[PDB]
Amino acid sequence: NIQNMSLEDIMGERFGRYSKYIIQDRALPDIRDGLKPVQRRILYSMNKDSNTFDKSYRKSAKSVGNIMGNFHPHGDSSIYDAMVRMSQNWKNREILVEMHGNNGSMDGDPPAAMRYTEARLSEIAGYLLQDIEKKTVPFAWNFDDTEKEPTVLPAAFPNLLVNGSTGISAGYATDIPPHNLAEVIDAAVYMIDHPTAKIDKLMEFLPGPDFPTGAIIQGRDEIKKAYETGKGRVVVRSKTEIEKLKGGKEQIVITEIPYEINKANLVKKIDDVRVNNKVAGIAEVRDESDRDGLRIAIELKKDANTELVLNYLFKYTDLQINYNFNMVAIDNFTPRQVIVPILSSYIAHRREVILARSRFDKEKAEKRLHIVEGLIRVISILDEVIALIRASENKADAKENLKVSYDFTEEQAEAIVTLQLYRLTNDVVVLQEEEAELREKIAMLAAIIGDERTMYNLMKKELREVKKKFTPRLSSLED
Amino acid sequence: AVRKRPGMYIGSTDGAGLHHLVWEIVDNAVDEALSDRIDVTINKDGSLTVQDHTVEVIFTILHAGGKFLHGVGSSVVNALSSWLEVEITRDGAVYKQRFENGGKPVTTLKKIGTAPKSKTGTKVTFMPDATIFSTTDFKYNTISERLNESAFLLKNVTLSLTDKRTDEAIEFHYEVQDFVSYLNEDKEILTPVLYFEGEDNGFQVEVALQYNDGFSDNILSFVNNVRTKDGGTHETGLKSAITKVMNDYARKTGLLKEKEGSDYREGLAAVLSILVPEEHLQFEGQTKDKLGSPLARPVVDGIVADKLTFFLMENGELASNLIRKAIKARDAREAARKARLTPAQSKNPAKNELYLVEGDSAGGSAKQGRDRKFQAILPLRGKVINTAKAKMADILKNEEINTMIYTIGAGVGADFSIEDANYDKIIIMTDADTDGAHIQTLLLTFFYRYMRPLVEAGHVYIAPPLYKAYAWTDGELEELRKLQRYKGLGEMNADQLWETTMNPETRTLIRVTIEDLARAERRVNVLMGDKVEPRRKWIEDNVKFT
DNA sequence: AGTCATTCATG
DNA sequence: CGTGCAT
Ligand SMILES: C[C@H]1COc2c(N3CCN(C)CC3)c(F)cc3c(=O)c(C(=O)O)cn1c23
Ligand SMILES: [Mg+2]
Ligand SMILES: [Mg+2]
């Protein structure tokens, strides 16, 4: 009927249970592919369903429902909001979901509910899933024990640094900003060649974050500090021009703001400064951003000290903010503050992946080569093979007779005996061409397996392709 | 001659009239035995026969609302019967005689046989005529309830009922305290049976009282072994005794705040029985349904108000708790005239249960699957505020917290009485997931920080099967092996939720017990406190990532 | 189809 | 205060 437990014990089996899960399976990105579980499931499920960049948009609610019923046992709001975020190009440096309809704005207005919008994976998101069908990554059973899901994606580009992550669990939080794809890939490529590379040298390739929202990042040494330790405070400041209006008045024009800042709240707080006259000078605040351009006009009064006003806004609004690195990711099942262990785990991961992919393709190529070898043989001996099957009592007896009389293996016997009659109309040469192409294919793969360097070259070759395909810096760097 | 205006003698009906002359005959034969076994029988015929252990015609006389050959001129049954056969065994012979319709004698009273010595006994069997009666079908259920409730005050007598149609039977005998049990048989019980005896100048009053979780009060009264269906001065003496004896008990070392009535009678059931000397006996008009005799009010109020000012002082358990109940009754009552969570139907802080359920959704199934008599439902909507991290300002401005502080009814903090509570068990019912774990954690810390006594008196609990025949352990499924795996209660129907986790017969509740206050205080304050580093380390040290 | 509030960590 | 998965 009733069993006692201590207050001290209850709060222990519970908070441990929760803590472990929120850290491993909710708030924190995997260090290799840079995804939280909800995002990986989103991408995996839409890809399983062929809802890719090259096909028609599919209703958001259909996608969300499948994710919920197959992989992610939580609310649809959370899944949908997560899916929507991965589509907002002012939050993601390289968006992974393309969404048709109101998916929000820099002003932070609610996205349309998932009954209105429609979505599909972006082309680049395709590269996170590249080769997932090739047994390249470890799979587990879903919540449901009905279906397998991937525990990490193949990640043909370094999404952790490219898109970023944030980041609140139990005992740990994470803030990793976005970086330029070409830059991050240049760094990875250097490190592949020079594994013991030092930060100073890596920063010749990867000078610092690259926000989708652009702006100005100030703090070379804190950037360095963060690349070494995973923690660091940098300054992020709006791009600003001044315009000399008629009649001796000036006007400050903002055109890029700090990452994660709500444009509309910022505009209101700057106008609050004007309405309250905390500092003198501001004539009018005017948000002039249209569908193709961000532009805020802070018109000044005649004989207004524009440097004073600007500086004050920089300090007392989010016209300028501090951005704090707190690079935490999940490495070998546990939370790590990390650059060296991060990159190295990733590199070891790609190694396992590429090795596994190659075993898989080689296996396929061999099974085939083995059959093609049997068929080449069969042709030297058709008339008597048809005779033999003619004399067999049934399928199983026919296979047996093919093994016993002509040494075919089971697998070859199965193939031979399940051929359609029309095949008997058919040339050993075509087959020999195939036999040769398979042998070459197997040699390439077997090398990769027996020798690491061939594999790392492939990985660099593929990362460079991704870079060539997917843009220039947005955020300027300043000492 | 009574045949002509039958309602006057009986109040004819269908068949309340038919069931009225049987009352008359039975009460008559009782009255006769009083001055030791009456047996009634419904026959296959349809006829009814009352017999008992010149007794004869003093017996067949009826219209008989009392207790405490010769005639046969106006036996109101004889007049109202198809035939009526009558038989007496007396002195050493047995005599029979029967009549038809009006009561015109079909034969003379003759000796129809030899009787076993001087042994005496009287018997009347009759069939009402279907002329003056519209229903001739005696109901055994009704006759039963009569004979039953009759036999309580009739200590001298035992009476039986046999239905030869349905071949069933009872018998009744009672050696006023039992009556309150009989009255509260299938009900739940706030106080035990209180019994107060006493003589006081001629009058003999004898009362038992016993509260239930019910609402309607239920007070029966008896003067001189018969019922005063309409109450009377003795009743007013009894009611006026409690409302003023308990008010005193409140006023004194209890609770009154200085500066109620029928609120004391909510769920009160009581059987009250006085003996009046008959020369002082006076009722209202025509019928002896309402005692009017003035002295009865201050003698019953005497005897009762005395004994239970003693009883109340005698044990502050069933006492101050009982008063509080009156004020909860006083509270909503005046809040109904001011009307011009899902609560348990009846208020019983001794068996009542409060269910804090994670989510309005699960809250729904809880409301539907519950036993509404003693189980209340409180849906918590969202994660509960962390009562360690937040300020006692914001903590008290929280809906989930604020309404538990109210629904529980004991206040909070050091201004907190565990006796003004509302439940014997507060039960936390969450999802069997990680977030349910989290929720249990935030509620436990609130109850510890702000209602420690409730957790200290082992009042706080925590409520499902893992497998489907059901099993909870990985071991219990292998014993069944000689399979569906439950992912949530949502895969829960109200039916299943009950059988499995809410039913006090088929459920398992972990009972929170504050064992080592000091190492318990370290645990809450480290897991839920403002400081992150302690927690992080507790996790790093105790949490097996692998 | 918006709106309301709460956890968790951090500067 | 605001962030984003959770309730
Ligand atoms: C689980 C429920 C709990 O209640 C919720 C809210 N309230 C909490 C109680 N408050 C007194 C009133 C507001 C809320 F404001 C927002 C949400 C919400 O966005 C949400 C979701 O599924 O996305 C789900 N829920 C919400
Ligand atoms: Mg929501
Ligand atoms: Mg749940």
Side-chain angles (χ1 to χ4, degrees), chain B residues 26 39-41 49 51 143 147 158-162 169-172:
Chain B
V26 134
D39 299 282
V40 203
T41 310
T49 143
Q51 84 147 290
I143 294 204
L147 287 186
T158 129
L159 26 63
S160 82
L161 196 197
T162 49
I170 346 110
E171 164 167 9
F172 305 90

Side-chain angles (χ1 to χ4, degrees), chain A residues 136-147 149-154:
Chain A
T136 54
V137 146
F139 274 70
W141 285 108
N142 53 5
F143 70 87
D144 175 300
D145 270 275
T146 163
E147 201 181 336
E149 54 174 339
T151 54
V152 46
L153 303 186

Side-chain angles (χ1 to χ4, degrees), chain B residues 321-327 329 332 335-336 339:
Chain B
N321 256 322
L322 225 178
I323 305 193
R324 205 172 286 103
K325 168 192 169 87
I327 334 172

Side-chain angles (χ1 to χ4, degrees), chain B residues 374-380 382-390 393 398-399 401-404 409-411:
Chain B
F374 73 97
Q375 284 175 350
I377 306 278
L378 209 200
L380 304 169
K383 312 250 226 191
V384 178
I385 187 153
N386 190 332
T387 47
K389 297 181 180 160
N398 193 239
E399 292 188 29
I401 300 280
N402 240 215
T403 86
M404 291 168 78

